[PDB]
Ligand binder design. Structure first.
Ligand SMILES: Nc1ncnc2c1ncn2[C@@H]1O[C@H](COP(=O)(O)OP(=O)(O)OP(O)(O)=S)[C@@H](O)[C@H]1O
Ligand SMILES: [Mg+2]
Ligand SMILES: [Mg+2]
Lengths: 1058, 317
């Protein structure tokens, strides 16, 4: 029955929304926040209020709006403004009070209550009591509580509650016992009274039921003395666990206050004060801390801080920093740490080791703040570098373990290196210089390398960043002995597991010319070969078949080395990859692209030297003889013609005729026509004709491409399915499918002519972002993530891509819907051209009209609608949407940092079972798309009309924007991890080719790209001088993504109207 | 066709420049203008030939030889040409381009090249010549208006509200007022300190008229200097009084029911010589002759298949 109750609601929402579609009314808007709330969807409803605000300032009073937005702090100062200008007004006061009882401002709530007791209004007399009871509760004053409780009716759950508390204080336990049970029942009957359309009072019921059960434990804590440990444990655990907003925890602690004073709970209230600071409620955290110290809100401001309770002082100090007073905060630290090391070195008479330890770990935390604060106050320069390096080393001394400290020390050293290197490119822009430079850099490099090592071993699961950094120093430093020894040390020291994370980055430099670097790489790879080969074969096999000599040589060495222990694996892998490459682009498919290219150079460019270079690899390609039926069947129908078309070519090479060369093209154009006809006939490939070796394969020990991970039992290629559907396209990729040794099937897409190596790094980046999101509690609460797919490169030409089930391209879903509803697929386009035959050449202004014209005469539902019709129920429909909204927003931000261009409606798809969204084709990364000459993208990511429409009405204000901040906030917190990854492949040597396409050294261009990224992660993407906070930046972006001026400029294919 | 006292030219997306006889709505001649839409039309002060600024060219058809094709073409400039203007003394021509340049062309010599170039960051939408022939006013998409002294080559720039694109600018014959209109739909009016002849020529702000909610596309002073016209994407040409800066007369073409989705933008206007009448270019394929005082449609120039984005209107003896 319960699962069926939300169904009718979800069903009503669909219509209630559809109504709003036709005419937005305050009526509907009311019955919308409510239904969205029964559906326990808080943030989507928060979006409805945003729209309610921006279109109807009509439940009025800016203080009433701040109150509904739970922004009590703004509503309180907005109510004061409204009170001092106006009069008494009995409603303005209640609001002014509600703000105080949320904020936990008992001092002002009790005062406001008594000091204003004319209250001739009798309803003003009823509410008044409830609040002023709890206010009196927080302020100790029990007399006041009793008075104000005597005015709360025992009919209300509230009135029954405060009696249980008054009794428990005065020690009347039978009274207290009954009052609880009455308060429960008066709350049970009340949750059915407002059966859904209520406040966060259904969520605050858990607050009252929590408190009532806790208040029964406070009962347990009064006469029978045996649970003082059992009770404190649950109280302690159901806290670190529990995640209830500041205000609720106040109340919960107030229950525990009846029995334990904060001075015995310490750890409890320190954690609570710790939460208040993190959720930016400082003035409250302060008051909790002042209480625990038992000393002034330091009104004695020039005095030193008390060291009575080392832990509390520390909190205070960081509260002071996070507060306004941060030179002051810094100052108290230096001095506190000094007091702390003396309080150790002297006061430690042996029979106190636990205290010494806990005192040494506190200091490490102090030193880390010290360095960190020093940096924030001064920056990085010849004077700070040594200080913070001392601060961090000091932190490293006092905790030894602790990732934070070793990390901090590593990064500081690493940034010392950077500081001088970037200071020296400053010098060289305008012999004893380099010798002192080499001394300088070497001085910080070695410890950086060292630091990153001890820090990596302290993560284990979470060290992609630190690991990548190790490689930066390792590759960048053309190797000085000192830095090498440090590396070798570390490599031995740290687990092999680690490096798997980073295999493509290592293989990137197999052929390093620096002899000291290669040796370590080659050795380290070999050892990774020893434990976890599999993790190594595919990527090595690729490398071993490479035009560049130094690569494939060095790759074979490690492969040879791997045969000494895993030979038949190496052998299987070798062949499977070989055969797949043959299958990817068949013989005629190559001759077709090679004949087009050959006729462009000759008949359209007069280039016979370049043309001969297009055909000669194709002729020698067949010179080897056919090896498959499909190769021989080609060799029949075409072989002799070609073998003699070359004969004429090689008569002209020596004769230099032009009639010799025209006999060749006479023959060449013959086979072209033949093949071109057969090309739309390839819609399936059969293994037995195309590659028999692959059909032959049974129970291999090679793993299913990109399924290997330790932890998980190895899944091997047990069989390859005999047929491959050829996806008839421009590149005609194959849809290969493999049978796994676990039973389950594994489908891939075998692509012939796209260097998959980029797509691989992007998936790496996504993986990290996925962890980051899984680790941020909010992002986890919401399930936020990027769906990724396996990317297994096979050559520079080809590779494999994981097939994602249940997906259709945006373009497909639409092609279907429009044909279903008898709408011409490309109608916005045909409208635009009817209006303006020369659309592409119009001025900006001219275009926006035509664009708007198209949009205004075509439906924007499609996607929204086809998703409704699809769904088997309405809760399934509702959820698929929630998933869709969120996942799209995730990739909007992530995609932005990546600079992910070219997001036309065939490059993103929607999973039809969860509704979550999926991006493919990562060819255009970093500003590339926007920098291009012809049709430059103006868009940061596609937030197009049908995508907007498909979310909830009140779209962008709701789930989308909220999720946008969340994701972005995570990305900014972890800006280095993200940049470690991104730096790794902007500067990757074999990957730099995708930016020299700005034509249609690189050292300088690569610098730009990465800055443009840091700019985005620091909120400096827009103006050079501002430093925009998240919601500003997000707003700016959504704006940009939505601008008609931007969209109308998009290459038509991009479908700026879908 | 230039021999008629009244020259009326209409150009747009349908590859023709049609000429009309003002008083009757009959289309006189029509000229082929293929490969591009027409961005601006201006008739030379000499009444000999009309200029058609388009995409990467300014073609110039002859009003006297009553028949042929472009006398002169100008080329070798990439992206659109948005504004044209002529200097009284027969020989100079000015242009604003998407290529971010204000160019001065010598009509009495050869060269696809232009005599001068004034480059800005961000594309130029409008270019107009102060009646003193000594200064060019140039509005760009960043929102900067540039006064470019044609003598000192001294550039001086002024931005109003902008981070917003200024769409057109104009300056009354008596050089007392300068106006500029932008994409927000605002209209800015400045007072003109007639420095001139050993020049200063200063701009003093007077009002910002909230002329439109949507894009404002052109602005123009009557010969009178009595009125200021403002064409917009809200399908409206609003005529403002210069004494008041209040709304005298609204000309509009917007359905008569909210469920129509518009049909047509008010792309351009030109006043008649006597400031009594006003011509109107719209995207609904028509030019229109209005009576400035009544706001009465006195004629409708039907002909163009596709949109109309241009007018030129001439009254000289
Ligand atoms: N990771 C994937 N999961 C599921 N389906 C996919 C995946 N990648 C591609 N497809 C499907 O395969 C079709 C072929 O598109 P692509 O994989 O991009 O090949 P393509 O022919 O190179 O595409 P271009 O370059 O845009 S013409 C797409 O329309 C998708 O439906
Ligand atoms: Mg694609
Ligand atoms: Mg592709």
């Amino acid at each position: 029955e319960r699962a069926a109750k939300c169904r009718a609601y979800a069903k009503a929402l669909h219509y209630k929304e559809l109504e709003f579609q036709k005419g937005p009314t305050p009526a509907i808007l009311e019955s919308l926040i409510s239904i969205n709330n029964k559906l326990q969807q808080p943030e989507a409803a928060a979006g409805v209020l945003e729209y309610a605000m921006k279109h109807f300032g009509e439940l009025e009073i800016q203080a009433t709006w701040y109150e509904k937005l739970h922004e009590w702090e703004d509503a309180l100062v907005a109510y004061d403004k409204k009170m001092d200008t106006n009069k008494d007004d009995p409603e303005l006061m209640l609001g002014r009070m509600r703000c105080l009882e949320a904020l936990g401002e008992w001092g002002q709530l009790h005062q406001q209550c008594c000091e204003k007791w004319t209250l001739v209004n009798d309803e003003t007399q009823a509410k008044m009591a409830r609040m002023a009871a709890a206010a009196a509760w927080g302020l100790g004053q029990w007399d006041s509580m009793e008075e104000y409780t005597c005015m709360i009716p025992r009919d209300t759950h509230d009135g029954a509650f405060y009696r249980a508390v008054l009794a428990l204080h005065q020690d009347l336990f039978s009274l207290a016992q009954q009052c609880i049970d009455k308060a429960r029942d008066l709350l049970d009957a009340e949750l059915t009274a407002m059966a859904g359309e209520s406040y966060s009072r259904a969520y605050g019921a858990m607050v009252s039921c929590h408190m009532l059960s806790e208040l029964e434990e406070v009962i347990q804590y009064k006469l029978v003395p045996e649970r003082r440990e059992i009770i404190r444990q649950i109280w302690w655990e159901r806290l670190q666990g529990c995640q209830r907003i500041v205000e609720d925890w106040q109340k919960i602690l107030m229950v525990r206050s009846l029995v334990v004073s904060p001075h015995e709970d310490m750890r409890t209230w320190l954690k609570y004060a710790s939460l208040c600071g993190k959720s930016g409620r400082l003035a409250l955290a302060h008051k909790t801390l002042v209480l625990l110290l038992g000393v002034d809100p330091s009104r004695q401001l020039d005095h030193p801080l008390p060291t009575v309770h080392p832990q509390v002082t520390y909190a205070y100090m960081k509260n002071m920093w996070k507060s306004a007073r941060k030179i002051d905060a810094f100052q108290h630290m230096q001095h506190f740490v000094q007091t702390m090391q003396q309080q150790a070195q002297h006061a430690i008479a042996t029979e106190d080791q636990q205290h010494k330890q806990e005192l040494h770990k506190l200091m490490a935390r102090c030193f880390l703040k010290l360095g960190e604060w020093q940096l924030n106050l001064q920056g990085i320069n010849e004077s700070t570098i040594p200080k913070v390096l001392q601060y961090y080393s000091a932190a490293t001394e006092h905790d030894r373990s602790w990732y934070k400290a070793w990390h901090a020390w590593a990064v500081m050293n690493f940034e010392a290196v950077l500081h001088y290197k970037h200071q020296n490119q400053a010098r060289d822009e305008k012999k004893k210089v380099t010798e002192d430079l080499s001394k300088t850099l070497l001085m910080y490099t070695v410890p950086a390398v060292q630091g990153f090592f001890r820090s990596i071993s302290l993560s284990r699961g979470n060290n992609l960043q630190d690991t990548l950094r190790v490689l930066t120093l390792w590759f960048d430093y053309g190797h000085w002995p000192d830095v090498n020894e440090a590396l070798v040390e570390g490599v031995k020291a740290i687990q092999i597991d680690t490096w798997l994370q980073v295999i493509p980055q290592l293989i990137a430099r197999i052929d390093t010319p620096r002899p000291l670097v290669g040796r370590l790489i080659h050795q380290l790879l070999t050892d990774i070969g020893r434990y976890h080969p599999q993790a190594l074969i595919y990527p090595l096999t690729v490398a071993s078949k490479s035009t560049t000599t130094a690569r494939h040589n060095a790759a074979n060495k490690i492969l040879k080395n791997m045969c000494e222990h895993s030979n038949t694996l190496v052998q299987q892998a070798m062949m499977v990859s070989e055969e797949l490459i043959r299958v990817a682009i068949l013989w005629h498919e190559m001759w077709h692209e090679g004949l087009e290219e050959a006729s462009r150079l000759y008949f359209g460019e007069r280039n016979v030297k370049g043309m001969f270079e297009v055909l000669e690899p194709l002729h020698a390609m067949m010179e080897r003889g056919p090896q498959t039926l499909k190769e021989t069947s080609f060799n029949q129908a075409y072989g002799r013609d070609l073998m003699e078309a070359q004969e004429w070519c090689r008569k002209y090479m020596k004769s230099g005729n032009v009639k010799d060369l025209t006999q060749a093209w006479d023959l060449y154009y013959h086979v072209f026509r033949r093949i071109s006809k057969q090309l739309p006939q390839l819609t399936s490939l059969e293994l037995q004709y195309v590659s028999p070796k692959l059909l032959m394969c049974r129970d291999l020990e090679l793993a299913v491409p990109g399924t290997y991970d330790p932890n998980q039992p190895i899944i091997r290629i047990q069989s390859i399915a005999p047929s491959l559907q050829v996806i008839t396209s421009k590149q005609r990729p194959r849809k290969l499918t493999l049978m796994g040794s676990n039973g389950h099937e594994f489908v891939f897409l075998l692509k012939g002519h796209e260097d998959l190596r980029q797509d691989e790094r992007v998936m790496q980046l996504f993986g990290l972002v996925n962890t980051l999101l899984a680790n941020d509690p909010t992002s986890l609460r919401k399930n936020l993530s990027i769906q990724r797919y396996a990317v297994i490169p096979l050559s520079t030409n080809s590779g494999l891509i994981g097939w994602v089930p249940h997906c259709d391209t945006l373009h497909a879903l639409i092609r279907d819907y429009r044909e279903k509803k008898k709408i011409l697929l490309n109608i916005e386009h045909r409208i635009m051209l009817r209006m303006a035959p020369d659309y592409d050449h119009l001025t900006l202004m001219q275009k926006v009209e035509v664009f708007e014209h198209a949009v205004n005469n075509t439906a924007g539902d499609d996607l929204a609608k086809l998703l409704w019709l699809k769904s088997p129920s309405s809760e399934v429909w509702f959820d698929r949407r929630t998933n869709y909204t969120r996942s799209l927003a995730v990739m909007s931000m992530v995609g932005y940092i990546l600079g992910l261009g070219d997001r036309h409606p065939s490059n993103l798809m929607l999973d039809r079972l969860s509704g979550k969204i999926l991006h493919i084709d990562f060819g255009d990364c970093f500003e590339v798309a926007m920098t291009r000459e012809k049709f430059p993208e103006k868009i940061p990511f596609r937030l197009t009309r049908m995508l907007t429409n498909a979310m909830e009405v009140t779209g962008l204000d709701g789930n989308y924007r909220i999720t946008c901040h969340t994701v972005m906030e995570v990305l900014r917190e972890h800006k280095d991890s993200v940049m470690a990854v991104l730096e790794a492949f902007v500067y990757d040597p074999l990957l730099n080719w995708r930016l020299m396409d700005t034509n249609t050294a690189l050292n300088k261009k690569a610098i730009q790209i990465i800055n443009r990224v840091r700019d985005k992660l620091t909120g400096r993407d827009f103006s050079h001088d501002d430093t925009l906070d998240v919601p500003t930046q997000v707003e700016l972006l959504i704006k940009q993504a939505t601008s008609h001026e931007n969209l109308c400029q998009c290459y038509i294919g991009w479908c700026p109207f879908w | 066709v230039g021999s008629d006292p009244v020259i009326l030219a209409t150009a747009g997306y349908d590859h023709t420049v049609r000429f009309w006889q003002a008083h009757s709505g009959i289309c006189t001649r029509t000229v082929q203008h293929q490969d591009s839409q027409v961005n601006a039309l201006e008739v030379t002060p000499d009444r000999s030939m009309i200029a058609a600024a388009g995409y990467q060219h300014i073609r110039m058809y002859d009003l006297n030889s009553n028949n042929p094709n472009p006398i002169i073409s100008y080329d070798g400039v990439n992206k659109n040409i948005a504004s044209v203007g002529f200097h009284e003394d027969g020989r100079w021509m000015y242009t604003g381009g998407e290529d971010c340049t204000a160019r001065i062309w010598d009509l009495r010599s050869r060269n696809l090249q232009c005599q001068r170039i004034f480059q800005v960051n961000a594309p130029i939408n409008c270019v107009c010549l102060h009646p003193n022939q000594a200064e060019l006013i140039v509005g760009d998409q960043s929102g900067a208006i540039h006064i470019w002294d044609l003598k000192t080559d001294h550039n001086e720039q002024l931005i109003p509200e902008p981070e917003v694109s200024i769409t057109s600018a104009h300056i009354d014959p008596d050089a007392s007022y300068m106006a500029a209109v932008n994409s927000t739909g605002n209209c800015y009016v400045w007072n003109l300190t007639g420095g001139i002849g050993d020049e200063v020529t200063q701009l003093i702000p007077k009002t910002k008229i909230p002329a439109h909610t949507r894009y404002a596309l052109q602005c123009r002073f009557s010969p009178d200097s009595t009125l200021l016209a403002t064409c917009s994407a809200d399908q409206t040409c609003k005529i403002w009084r210069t004494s008041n800066f209040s709304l005298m007369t609204e000309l509009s073409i917007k359905s008569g029911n909210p469920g129509e989705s518009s049909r047509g933008w008010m792309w351009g206007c030109a006043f008649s010589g006597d400031s009594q009448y006003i011509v109107t270019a719209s995207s609904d394929n028509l030019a229109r002759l209005w009576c400035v005082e009544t706001g009465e449609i006195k004629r409708e120039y039907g002909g163009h298949q596709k949109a109309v984005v241009c007018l030129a209107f001439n009254d000289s003896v």
